[PDB]
Amino acid sequence: TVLPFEAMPQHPGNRWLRLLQIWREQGYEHLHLEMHQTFQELGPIFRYNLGGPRMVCVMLPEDVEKLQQVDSLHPCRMILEPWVAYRQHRGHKCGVFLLNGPEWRFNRLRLNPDVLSPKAVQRFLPMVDAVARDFSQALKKKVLQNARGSLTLDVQPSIFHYTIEASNLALFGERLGLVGHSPSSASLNFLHALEVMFKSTVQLMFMPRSLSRWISPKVWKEHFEAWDCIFQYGDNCIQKIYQELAFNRPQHYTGIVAELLLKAELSLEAIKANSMELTAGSVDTTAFPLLMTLFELARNPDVQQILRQESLAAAASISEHPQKATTELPLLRAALKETLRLYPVGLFLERVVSSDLVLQNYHIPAGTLVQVFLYSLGRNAALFPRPERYNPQRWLDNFHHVPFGFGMRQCLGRRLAEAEMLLLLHHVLKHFLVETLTQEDIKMVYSFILRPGTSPLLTFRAINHHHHHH
């Protein structure tokens, strides 16, 4: 009664034809649209002619729920070779994202309490909030210098500097001075290295190393250089804290990586490695969903008014105890789910499943690469009535919200990312109206992360006309 694997419809692509297109185009910007169309054509599940091993593409919660059941003690993902290649080339340990098996669980169990748990959030949220305030304040100052009490900009650079600053405070306990000031040359280089790293990832990611070694030798060279610059940026941060904590163990909280070095449950190389993942990880992944949310508010001003109404009503509580924003801004929290439904930074969830199972009435063998395309998932009209509509209310009225993945491998940085996102939006909403003429869809572009190919011109208009009061 259950259909066999080969009964499953097939993506009509040769791994080779896409291999060669990636070599030619130096990327794969339209992946999300290719998969989306393929589900449009073949229905909610299909397989892909991969270089041997089975691979299946799904888009329904049902399938995620099932997929979580099959998570062993050690859930597993496809090795990301270019990234792992770098660590081995320079002698570095791999952090959680690149670890599988017991080394992974061991790390993860020693990182959850200080990065993801609610006790941790209670401690870093006020640090984030200070940065969120300083962003708004800086922007309001520029706004009130203008005769019309507004500023019209590409907000992207300043949002990226916001996430570098908020993350570095939460992770290392240091203010970099990047909010309300110009980018440092270190921050610009870091941003560029991340972008080159991500792009070159897409180029090396869809072929085996044996082939790419001689087909794309200078893409490897590019990718390692990018990593080298990312690693220098992170090692600078680690050296400063490590020397500081060698001489004085503070009595109070000074961030997430301090908790890890004080406890010293993980080894130094293991802390270094996980700290690089948190530093590299905390910039683009949070920045683009913020930009997208600003964009959707800008062109859904009625939804914007509702969210402001809420944020104005909680201003007093959140001024007094910043932690209360997590519970007192449910509609804004819901807006974020809405942004990640439409614009999922992580395009697909992925497991190399360790046991036979059944998705969609098809038999899925042990060792099958299963991928969950969140882009299509979020646009299923039967589960998301009017999926084109940006409607945060839809979450107030289970496995529908899974942009951070699921289970024990669920995003380690979820609560930091949410904190950063929510608090910046909260303070912006209290002080500014946000507007655009660009009322039409921003094309998303896939380059390991899913990101806008365009930044809209947004206008921030002071409601009040006072630098502090909202």
Ligand X SMILES: C[C@]12CC[C@H]3[C@@H](CCC4=CC(=O)CC[C@@]43C)[C@@H]1CC[C@@H]2C(=O)CO
Binding site for a second copy (CB under 8 A): 14, 16, 19-20, 24, 51, 211, 214-215
- The answer on whether 348 is annotated among ligand-binding residues is yes
Please identify which residue in 286, 293, 304, 391 interacts with ligand HEM, judged by CB under 6 A: 286
**Part of the chain binding ligand X (CB under 6 A), chosen from 7-15, 155-163, 279-287, 361-369:** 279-287
Torsions phi, psi for 12 (to 5 deg): -80, 20
| E-state strands within 291-408 | 348-352, 357-359, 362-364, 369-373
- The answer on whether 237 is annotated among ligand-binding residues is no
Examine residue 280 and tell whether it contacts ligand X (CB under 6 A). Answer: yes
Exposure class string for 332-343: b at 16+ Cβ within 10 A, else e: bbbbbbbbbbbb
**Part of the chain binding ligand HEM (CB under 6 A), chosen from 84-92, 177-185, 241-249, 340-348:** 340-348
Q: What does 448 interact with, of ligand HEM, a second copy, ligand X, none (CB < 5 to 8 A by kind)?
A: ligand X
| Binding pattern for the stretch 59-98 against ligand X, x by CB under 6 A and - elsewhere | --------------------------------------x-
Examine residue 404 and tell whether it contacts ligand HEM (CB under 6 A). Answer: yes
Among 231, 294, 253, which residue's Cα sits nearest to residue 455? 294
**Least gap, CB of 160 to ligand HEM (angstroms):** 13
Q: What does 348 interact with, of ligand HEM, a second copy, ligand X, none (CB < 5 to 8 A by kind)?
A: ligand X
**Least gap, CB of 422 to ligand X (angstroms):** 18
DSSP annotation of 160? H
Nearer to a second copy, 51 or 102 (CB): 51
Residue 94 burial (10 A CB sphere; 0-12, 13-18, 19+): buried
Residue tagged 């509509």 (tokens): 389
CB 279 within 8 A of CB 234: yes
Examine residue 349 and tell whether it contacts ligand X (CB under 6 A). Answer: yes
**Part of the chain binding ligand X (CB under 6 A), chosen from 167-175, 244-252, 289-297, 342-350:** 342-350
Q: For ligand HEM, how many residues bind (rule: CB under 6 A)?
A: 26
**Part of the chain binding ligand X (CB under 6 A), chosen from 15-23, 60-68, 253-261, 275-283:** 275-283
CB 186 within 8 A of CB 177: no
CB 421 within 8 A of CB 293: yes
DSSP string, 90-131: HTPPP-GGG--HHHHHHHHHHHHHHHTSHHHHHHHHHHHHHH
**Least gap, CB of 81 to a second copy (angstroms):** 18
| Rounded Cα distance, 378 and 383, in Å | 8
Residue 225 structure tokens: 């250089």
Which residues touch 46 (CB under 8 Å, ≥6 apart)? Answer: 8, 9, 10, 11, 38, 39, 56, 57
Nearer to ligand HEM, 165 or 277 (CB): 277
Q: Which residues bind ligand X (CB under 6 A)?
A: 97, 277, 280-281, 285, 345-350, 405, 448-449
The annotation places the binding site for 21-hydroxyprogesterone at 348
Q: Which residues bind ligand HEM (CB under 6 A)?
A: 96-97, 108, 277-278, 281-282, 285-286, 289, 340, 345-346, 349, 403-407, 409-413, 416-417
The annotation places the binding site for heme at 411
